[PDB]
Enzyme design. Structure first.
Site, PDB file in Angstrom:
ATOM      1  N   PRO A 164       0.814  -1.216   0.000  1.00 43.09           N
ATOM      2  CA  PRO A 164       0.000   0.000   0.000  1.00 43.09           C
ATOM      3  C   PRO A 164       0.844   1.260   0.000  1.00 43.09           C
ATOM      4  O   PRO A 164       0.326   2.328   0.318  1.00 43.09           O
ATOM      5  CB  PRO A 164      -0.801  -0.130   1.291  1.00 43.09           C
ATOM      6  CG  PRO A 164      -1.005  -1.607   1.402  1.00 43.09           C
ATOM      7  CD  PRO A 164       0.310  -2.209   0.964  1.00 43.09           C
ATOM      8  N   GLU A 165       2.114   1.102  -0.376  1.00 44.94           N
ATOM      9  CA  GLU A 165       3.109   2.164  -0.552  1.00 44.94           C
ATOM     10  C   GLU A 165       3.692   2.598   0.793  1.00 44.94           C
ATOM     11  O   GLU A 165       3.033   2.583   1.843  1.00 44.94           O
ATOM     12  CB  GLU A 165       2.548   3.379  -1.321  1.00 44.94           C
ATOM     13  CG  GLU A 165       1.705   3.060  -2.579  1.00 44.94           C
ATOM     14  CD  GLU A 165       2.482   3.065  -3.885  1.00 44.94           C
ATOM     15  OE1 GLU A 165       3.732   3.130  -3.863  1.00 44.94           O
ATOM     16  OE2 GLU A 165       1.832   3.010  -4.956  1.00 44.94           O
ATOM     17  N   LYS A 171       7.060  -1.957   3.388  1.00 48.61           N
ATOM     18  CA  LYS A 171       5.637  -2.264   3.443  1.00 48.61           C
ATOM     19  C   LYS A 171       5.203  -2.935   4.748  1.00 48.61           C
ATOM     20  O   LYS A 171       4.038  -3.323   4.861  1.00 48.61           O
ATOM     21  CB  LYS A 171       5.244  -3.152   2.258  1.00 48.61           C
ATOM     22  CG  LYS A 171       5.445  -2.517   0.880  1.00 48.61           C
ATOM     23  CD  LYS A 171       4.494  -3.154  -0.125  1.00 48.61           C
ATOM     24  CE  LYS A 171       4.992  -2.982  -1.561  1.00 48.61           C
ATOM     25  NZ  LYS A 171       4.481  -4.053  -2.453  1.00 48.61           N
ATOM     26  N   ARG A 176       1.289  -5.906 -11.327  1.00 42.44           N
ATOM     27  CA  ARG A 176       1.644  -6.096 -12.718  1.00 42.44           C
ATOM     28  C   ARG A 176       1.128  -4.958 -13.583  1.00 42.44           C
ATOM     29  O   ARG A 176       1.729  -4.676 -14.615  1.00 42.44           O
ATOM     30  CB  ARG A 176       1.134  -7.457 -13.190  1.00 42.44           C
ATOM     31  CG  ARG A 176       1.918  -8.572 -12.551  1.00 42.44           C
ATOM     32  CD  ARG A 176       1.216  -9.884 -12.612  1.00 42.44           C
ATOM     33  NE  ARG A 176       1.835 -10.689 -13.651  1.00 42.44           N
ATOM     34  CZ  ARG A 176       1.384 -10.794 -14.893  1.00 42.44           C
ATOM     35  NH1 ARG A 176       0.235 -10.251 -15.260  1.00 42.44           N
ATOM     36  NH2 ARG A 176       2.103 -11.463 -15.787  1.00 42.44           N
TER      37      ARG A 176
END
Ligand SMILES: [Zn+2]
Length: 253
Positions: free
Chosen positions: A1-2, A49, A239
């Site tokens: 989630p960055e 993360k 992806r």
DNA sequence: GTAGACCTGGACG
DNA sequence: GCGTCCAGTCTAC
């Protein structure tokens, strides 16, 4: 989630460090709430993360949190449904740590017991200690840069919004091999990694909206059609790739 | 095994 | 503004 998202979560945890856990709730199967209650939250650490919490009366127990698309940490506040799903059901937190004076709620996150933390800011794109030498050595390999940027060993905190945006800002095609890029190119790519992640964080501290340049856009800033496709290992959750063939021509062997 | 919601911001129409 | 869409962990089957 960055990684910016994880820095926020860690900051929300921070004021509860050092308090006794009174009650523990939530729906999670794995974690017996009867390991936490009446221990102190004696440490909280963030790396890339992952979020690590230590419980003890001081070494201690560590819970690791790895968050999903809708994962969140909430400080003395619950999330709620705003409208009906197409077929109104409130989300259920997976863990809640209650203190005498507040609580922490953990949503859409895998939570597990671990030996401890691995929190080194050399590999972390938002830390001051972010080691660009190792990042460059990773980027230079004969692999598409868009794959290497997501390797959390070298770019802890880098997720799909950053991947797509910085490749556009550096005008690099996502399938260009790091080995076919110039050293100046990869230097610009690292510069943009750091700058964009930091700028996004600044926008998040205020309530400003982050506006995408390429990510989830039909056209680029120049007005070109934006292509979308999925590349990388089938396990990967990032992806999806947005790019402008005109602004980001694939570098050739 | 696969299919899909997700309480939601940001981007479209 | 109004409406609709969709992009790691979890659930249903
Ligand atoms: Zn373009």
């Amino acid at each position: 989630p960055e990684g910016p998202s994880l820095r926020k979560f860690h900051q929300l945890v921070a004021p509860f460090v050092g308090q006794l856990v009174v009650t523990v709730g939530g729906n999670s199967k794995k974690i017996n709430p009867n390991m936490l209650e009446m221990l102190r939250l004696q440490d909280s650490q963030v790396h890339g993360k992952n979020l690590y919490l230590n419980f003890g009366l001081t070494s201690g127990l560590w819970l690791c949190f790895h968050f999903g698309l809708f994962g969140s940490v909430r400080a003395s506040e619950l999330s709620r449904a705003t409208k009906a799903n197409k077929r109104w059901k409130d989300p259920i937190p997976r863990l809640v740590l209650h203190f005498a004076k507040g609580f922490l709620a953990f949503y859409n996150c895998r939570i597990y017991w671990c030996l401890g933390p691995t929190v080194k800011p050399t590999s972390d794109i938002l830390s001051e200690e972010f080691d660009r030498r190792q990042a460059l050595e990773a980027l230079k390999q004969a692999s598409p840069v868009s794959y290497t940027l997501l390797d959390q060993r070298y770019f802890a905190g880098l997720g799909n919004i950053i991947k797509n945006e910085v490749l556009y800002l550096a005008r690099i095609h996502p399938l260009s091999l790091g080995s076919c890029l110039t050293p100046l190119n990869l230097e610009s790519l690292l510069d943009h990694v750091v700058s964009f992640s930091v700028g996004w964080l600044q926008k998040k501290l205020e309530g400003k909206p982050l506006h995408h340049l390429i990510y989830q856009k039909e056209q680029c800033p120049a007005g070109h059609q934006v292509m979308k496709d999925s590349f990388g290992p089938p396990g990967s959750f990032q992806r999806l790739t947005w790019w402008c063939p005109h602004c980001q021509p694939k570098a050739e062997e």
